Design an enzyme around this catalytic site. Structure first.
Site, PDB file in Angstrom:
ATOM      1  N   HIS A 189      10.999  -2.936  12.069  1.00 22.61           N
ATOM      2  CA  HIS A 189      12.199  -2.059  12.019  1.00 22.61           C
ATOM      3  C   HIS A 189      13.086  -2.468  13.163  1.00 22.61           C
ATOM      4  CE1 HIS A 189       8.919   0.503  10.445  1.00 22.61           C
ATOM      5  NE2 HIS A 189       9.820   1.066   9.676  1.00 22.61           N
TER       6      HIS A 189
ATOM      7  N   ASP B 299      11.864  -1.114  16.450  1.00 24.08           N
ATOM      8  CA  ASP B 299      10.628  -1.653  17.000  1.00 24.08           C
ATOM      9  C   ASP B 299      10.928  -2.873  17.902  1.00 24.08           C
ATOM     10  OD1 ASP B 299       9.128   0.027  15.236  1.00 24.08           O
ATOM     11  OD2 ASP B 299       9.069  -1.588  13.714  1.00 24.08           O
TER      12      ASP B 299
ATOM     13  N   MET C 155      10.308 -10.340   6.444  1.00 26.68           N
ATOM     14  CA  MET C 155      10.851  -9.044   5.990  1.00 26.68           C
ATOM     15  C   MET C 155      11.255  -8.295   7.226  1.00 26.68           C
ATOM     16  SD  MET C 155       9.942  -5.580   5.900  1.00 26.68           S
ATOM     17  CE  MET C 155       8.220  -5.261   5.662  1.00 26.68           C
TER      18      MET C 155
ATOM     19  N   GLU D 216      10.837   1.205  -1.065  1.00 23.96           N
ATOM     20  CA  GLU D 216       9.453   1.632  -0.890  1.00 23.96           C
ATOM     21  C   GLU D 216       9.309   3.091  -1.238  1.00 23.96           C
ATOM     22  OE1 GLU D 216       7.885   0.587   2.915  1.00 23.96           O
ATOM     23  OE2 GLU D 216       6.188   1.895   2.681  1.00 23.96           O
TER      24      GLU D 216
ATOM     25  N   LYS E  66       7.467   6.778  -1.707  1.00 22.63           N
ATOM     26  CA  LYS E  66       6.401   7.616  -1.127  1.00 22.63           C
ATOM     27  C   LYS E  66       6.597   9.017  -1.660  1.00 22.63           C
ATOM     28  CE  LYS E  66       4.186   8.677   3.293  1.00 22.63           C
ATOM     29  NZ  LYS E  66       4.373   8.639   4.787  1.00 22.63           N
TER      30      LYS E  66
ATOM     31  N   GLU F  96       3.323   0.683  -1.796  1.00 22.44           N
ATOM     32  CA  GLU F  96       2.277   0.756  -0.757  1.00 22.44           C
ATOM     33  C   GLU F  96       1.048   1.436  -1.308  1.00 22.44           C
ATOM     34  OE1 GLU F  96       1.876   2.881   3.640  1.00 22.44           O
ATOM     35  OE2 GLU F  96       3.331   1.265   3.246  1.00 22.44           O
TER      36      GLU F  96
ATOM     37  N   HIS G  99       0.537   5.125  -0.657  1.00 25.50           N
ATOM     38  CA  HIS G  99       1.611   6.018  -1.116  1.00 25.50           C
ATOM     39  C   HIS G  99       1.384   6.432  -2.537  1.00 25.50           C
ATOM     40  CE1 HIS G  99       4.713   4.600   2.044  1.00 25.50           C
ATOM     41  NE2 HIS G  99       3.620   5.048   2.590  1.00 25.50           N
TER      42      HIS G  99
ATOM     43  N   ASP H   5       2.919  -3.546   0.314  1.00 29.13           N
ATOM     44  CA  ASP H   5       2.335  -3.015   1.563  1.00 29.13           C
ATOM     45  C   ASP H   5       0.887  -2.638   1.270  1.00 29.13           C
ATOM     46  OD1 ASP H   5       4.727  -3.116   3.116  1.00 29.13           O
ATOM     47  OD2 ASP H   5       4.964  -0.972   3.317  1.00 29.13           O
TER      48      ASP H   5
ATOM     49  N   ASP I 123      -0.930  10.713   4.577  1.00 23.28           N
ATOM     50  CA  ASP I 123      -1.061   9.251   4.529  1.00 23.28           C
ATOM     51  C   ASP I 123      -1.834   8.794   5.740  1.00 23.28           C
ATOM     52  OD1 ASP I 123       1.566  10.388   5.298  1.00 23.28           O
ATOM     53  OD2 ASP I 123       2.038   8.186   5.755  1.00 23.28           O
TER      54      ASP I 123
ATOM     55  N   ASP J 258      -3.109   5.495   6.291  1.00 26.03           N
ATOM     56  CA  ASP J 258      -2.812   4.145   6.775  1.00 26.03           C
ATOM     57  C   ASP J 258      -4.049   3.469   7.308  1.00 26.03           C
ATOM     58  OD1 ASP J 258      -0.124   4.390   5.977  1.00 26.03           O
ATOM     59  OD2 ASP J 258       0.643   4.366   7.990  1.00 26.03           O
TER      60      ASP J 258
ATOM     61  N   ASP K 159       0.570  -2.600   6.150  1.00 27.41           N
ATOM     62  CA  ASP K 159       1.258  -1.476   6.731  1.00 27.41           C
ATOM     63  C   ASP K 159       0.190  -0.465   7.009  1.00 27.41           C
ATOM     64  OD1 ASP K 159       2.847   0.499   7.676  1.00 27.41           O
ATOM     65  OD2 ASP K 159       4.075   0.624   5.875  1.00 27.41           O
TER      66      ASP K 159
HETATM   67 MG   LIG Z   1       5.009   0.978   4.151  1.00 28.61          MG
END
Ligand SMILES: [Mg+2]
Ligand SMILES: [Mg+2]
Ligand SMILES: [Mg+2]
Ligand SMILES: [Mg+2]
Lengths: 384, 384, 384, 384
Positions: free
Chosen positions: D52, D55, D86, D179, D181, D215, D218, D243, D253, D255, D285
């Site tokens: 991002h 980040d 990406m 994406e 979710k 993802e 998700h 993802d 979620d 992860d 991810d």
């Molecule tokens: Mg993701």
């Protein structure tokens, strides 16, 4: 639908004080001084507040800072007439508790979590709390090898037994309420439902000192019927506290204001608490959404109480309606409350009406009339 | 991975005998004679079968038809060496039980459900069963006014107490296992999880006579961790029976063969049963999908046992691996098993290492090493 | 809250005609003649009925039996003024469809499912239906190797394209509505949500001939927001039909009467349909619980309509309330409806108010006022 | 199972860099410099990283701070041979985005979210990214009146159309991947599944510029079959990114590392990506649990890749096994891939084998043999 002291509505400091940090976002509101929250809650007609140790006294405070924080809080209580019926420990935020407090794999952390708890039990008693909640939000695991659950239950029992010995040794009139949650922040949390918590309590050395603190959204996170679980807790004599909020299904815990989420479940909950004569505080454990400013915080808190009182009125009207009373008889709710076999085993065994001469097809033809009863309940809820 | 009698794998008649009717479809297979199922199961290496009354004797059978059905079944048992370790009652299919057996609002139905149960307890004992399962699949409600849950729990307790008095009066060596399920076929089922069932048992007059019969998919229908619930049942001493199958999440109960559904949960389950030395039958309560012919029925049943044995081998290899034993110590599983405060309350209170001199930041810096441990577990499961 | 023909409330024959068979229970009610259902529905104020082929004509009927069944049904329609706005095919009950109709792995079954569909399309047109629903309840799998989903989508597209060619070839004024469901009776169903169905339609040869038939409980079986999915279908111009019922969360499809289940979602649904001017039938796809006799069947059906009309009144009062209109402006719902950048890309790029001179902290301080708006909505729903 | 550049494994900076803050806990790890993460990932055999905006460049950085951050990052890329395939925008953390970016009710915020995106698209292109992901995690609502979904979809379309015009105007070779979710951090998120995102894309002005970024966790948050959704995305030609992670069911979620969570779904996913010849990066991810120190972070990341490669080997062995190839034919997977009616509509209509002379009972008697096929798949997965 204006709240009164007898309504005994209470709020956690961390509810209206939630700054809005979530898994994907920074705070959207400034921190509230507990004094401000006490005053604002009182103005809305709340009867009391509750606290984690760390909500009232910043973690790591000196004795003098601790005393000052408590003094200011007590002044606000005295200024408003607010009570402090319940307190609890934060055994979840600090990194040291990342694998648990009472069931951390590290023994040093377990001992520390007990000492942190005991310190705040003394404070709770000083502030007049009669209930001490324990939410073991870090007790559990993300992976199977990380946590031997039988050993963790042994540690959990040891911890609660030590707390029971402590309160007994001090002569305190405080009881514990264990708050189940199925998951979040651990992948799975130990004692995930009301049932698991009730069962656990019966294994403690002094089970009379412990009950449950069920939370609406927590049981709904497992797709369970919250009114049913409250009924089992009442049946067991173990409903020592309750946490009220809203939740839309099986997802992350939303902590919506009470009445939001599953509205019909909220109706049946209120009906049950009021019919059973539950005498404890109606405590809200909710978070005003992070979309809101402080006006919206106070609106959301007011809405908690308002929705409880609207539902109370509608449930009472349902139960008092002669048409509903007739429909309850038509559905044989009266017969559900009568013993199956007060005549005894041998009499049942000898009763041909219970077997050889029971007309199963005639019994099966009888409708239960549950749909008409439920539409009366719907009509009453909606004021139709 | 070939099954042996000591594996004690058992199957319900209604598992491999399921004809394939579902909410939206007619049967896809013909009915099986119980004799055929006994023979085919034995050939696959099963050790025993189980039954509902109505699976063995058609509902409404005369005494002579009852005797003939039992005689044929017993011949097949004798022909094969198959055992009957468990039996249960069908208190769900017949329309008369549409609102329950033991907790039907109609008292006449409650009494009938007790008499139907007691009849089959006598049969179970004649066939050598040492466990009697009760799955109250019709106990519950779709609407809130239909079922007062406190009254229903009173009726449920009364029923199980009468059954306990009955077995005690006859001098039988049989114990009960209550099977929780959260929903399906009722909107919500009473005693919806292992925890609620454990808690209920403690309120019975003779709690030693009752345990739980947890089923993999049932706890997973509430999104709960099945291994964790089995651990709490073992911790309580109440794992009297288990039902093994697969389930893909929170949905209708699928009754997939064991190993299908949540494979990692299956691995941790087997690891726990074997580590704990569980001594009961490994019973499969599953349905071969209705897509299958009889070859696929027998394949699915064989797969149940095969997957249990593959998982058993992998879990044993995990636990025996010196690298895993080291990783368990690195994650402090050994410390989880040691008492928090065998020194006692006062010693803990006096221990500055537990409070004033506990270095919270040093403790928090310690990694748990759970990811390396779990990847060892994954490597072992996959044979990598 | 008495229904009128303009309300356009419609019911499937299989709704009130459901005999009560479930995964664990036999029928609790006798079969209804379609003629009786038409008359009883009309008496309650329904405007029309719908049917699967097999609900109207017993599977395997001769041409003369087919004609007689249709003749009697048409007489009941004429006797009552009831309409038949929609029809559909049963491609799920018969064992031949155990792996699907249009996406069965066996090609012979796929071809048969098309021919069965086309036969009933001709009947639907004869009875004046303008919508033809397709619910592929058997399309999917329990296991991963059983169904190559790309190949199955190719077959599904081929089937719907052939149906489109058929209706076009006959000059019929009928359109198709694909009904998503996420699971049940297959472990996973293809096109599991409104979104997947909308996306699929865009790949068809004649996409204008197909829309969606979303069902309240189906989207709620995946924990999705039904009003949101209906909004996306309206936004796409693809809401060709709707199925109304209730569901309590993520569990087996309950098919409760409309208004039961998630009451607040029902309120927002009605608000959306009425605000958007949806012109199609308000069709109920529900099952009176098997606890009920026929009086309870008719009560449950009446309750569907009643709850829709109560909700309609409350939603209209919400939207007309000047205080709500003010709260909508306070929450910037008016601004949501205005283009972000009607000035165009380059203007946005050149606009320092959108970047260098955008005061992020001032914007972030603004409350959304969503809680006050939602409590107005709650007050209106409850008539408070 | 050691990773290679051709494996194209990639990681977000925010994955291994997650400090461990959750809804109930403070950070447990220090922040990582992106340079350190690039070097450590490369050492494990990763091929690239993603980011991002926020980040890589701290929010609010001056142009000189921005340049320095990018320069250091580029040096680490050059030092290691890591790629940046990406990038994406953070339109969720900052309080200004509490009601959305592209669909915020405030128009000023919408415009700002576009300008923030466009800035980072230019950076992404400078770093060689060919995909630009958009995760609208704040797009949605907690309450029904807060968000008119049709208006929000209009704003969402307007935003993505402006981005498409921007990339086209600059001549960039970058495409977008939306994406989905279903919820978290909003109560409900707009475009909640792969299907809703696919359908939305077809309404854009330049649909060829947009695909999906599904993802694992998700789709599993809605209880959906992730392999099935990936299949529909491949069928549509829209799988522009993926993802990878783990999730245990319908809950917040999690992860988890890839391979954890639903292991059998992971197997079928890998089988599908490899069989279909998916050519994009295998992007993780995920979040190393907050229990872990940095050794555990790197272990968890390594485990992502390891599990992908173990599964790849087992899926390839499954597909290459002549016994599985035979079982696939036995289950008619070959027939699923053949057109239903390449003979055409009229030929089907005229084909008595498809109707009058189709023996439904013979067809229904055929088993699908799916259980034997699935147990071969299980045997292969476990290396049995
Ligand atoms: Mg993701
Ligand atoms: Mg709470
Ligand atoms: Mg079972
Ligand atoms: Mg439907």
């Amino acid at each position: 639908y204006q709240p009164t002291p007898e309504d005994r509505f209470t709020f956690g400091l961390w509810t209206v004080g939630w700054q809005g940090r979530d898994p994907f976002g920074d705070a959207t509101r400034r921190a509230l001084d507990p004094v401000e929250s006490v005053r604002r809650l009182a103005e809305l007609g709340a009867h009391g507040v509750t606290f984690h140790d760390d909500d009232l006294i910043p973690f790591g405070s000196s004795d003098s800072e601790r005393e000052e924080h408590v003094k200011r809080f007590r002044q606000a209580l005295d200024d408003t007439g607010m009570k402090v019926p319940m307190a609890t420990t934060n055994l979840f935020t600090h990194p040291v508790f990342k694998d648990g407090g009472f069931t951390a794999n590290d023994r040093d952390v377990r001992r520390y979590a007990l000492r942190k708890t005991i310190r705040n039990i003394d404070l709770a008693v000083e502030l007049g709390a009669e209930t001490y909640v324990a939410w073991g939000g870090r007790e559990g695991a993300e992976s199977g090898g990380a946590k031997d659950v039988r050993d963790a239950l042994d540690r959990m029992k040891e911890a609660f037994d030590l707390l029971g010995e402590y309160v007994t040794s001090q002569g305190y009139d405080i009881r514990f309420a264990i708050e189940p949650k199925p998951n979040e922040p651990r992948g799975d949390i130990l004692l995930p439902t009301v049932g698991h918590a009730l069962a656990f309590i019966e294994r403690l050395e002094r089970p009379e000192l412990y009950g449950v603190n069920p939370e609406v959204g927590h049981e709904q996170m497992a797709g369970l019927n919250f009114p049913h679980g409250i009924a089992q807790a009442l049946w067991a004599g173990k409903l020592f506290h309750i946490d009220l909020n809203g939740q839309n299904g099986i997802k992350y815990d939303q902590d919506l204001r009470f009445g939001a989420g599953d509205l019909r479940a909220a109706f049946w909950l209120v009906d049950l608490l009021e019919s059973a004569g539950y005498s404890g505080p109606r405590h809200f454990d909710f978070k005003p959404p992070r979309t809101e400013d402080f006006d919206g915080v106070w609106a959301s808190a007011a809405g908690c109480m308002r929705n409880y009182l609207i539902l109370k009125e509608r449930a009472a009207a349902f139960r008092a309606d002669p048409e509903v009373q007739e429909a309850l008889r038509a559905s044989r709710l009266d017969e559900l409350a009568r013993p199956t076999a007060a005549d005894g085993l041998q009499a049942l065994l000898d009763d041909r009406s219970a077997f050889e001469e029971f007309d199963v097809d005639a019994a099966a033809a009888r409708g239960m009339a549950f749909e008409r009863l439920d539409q009366l309940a719907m009509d009453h809820l909606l004021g139709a």
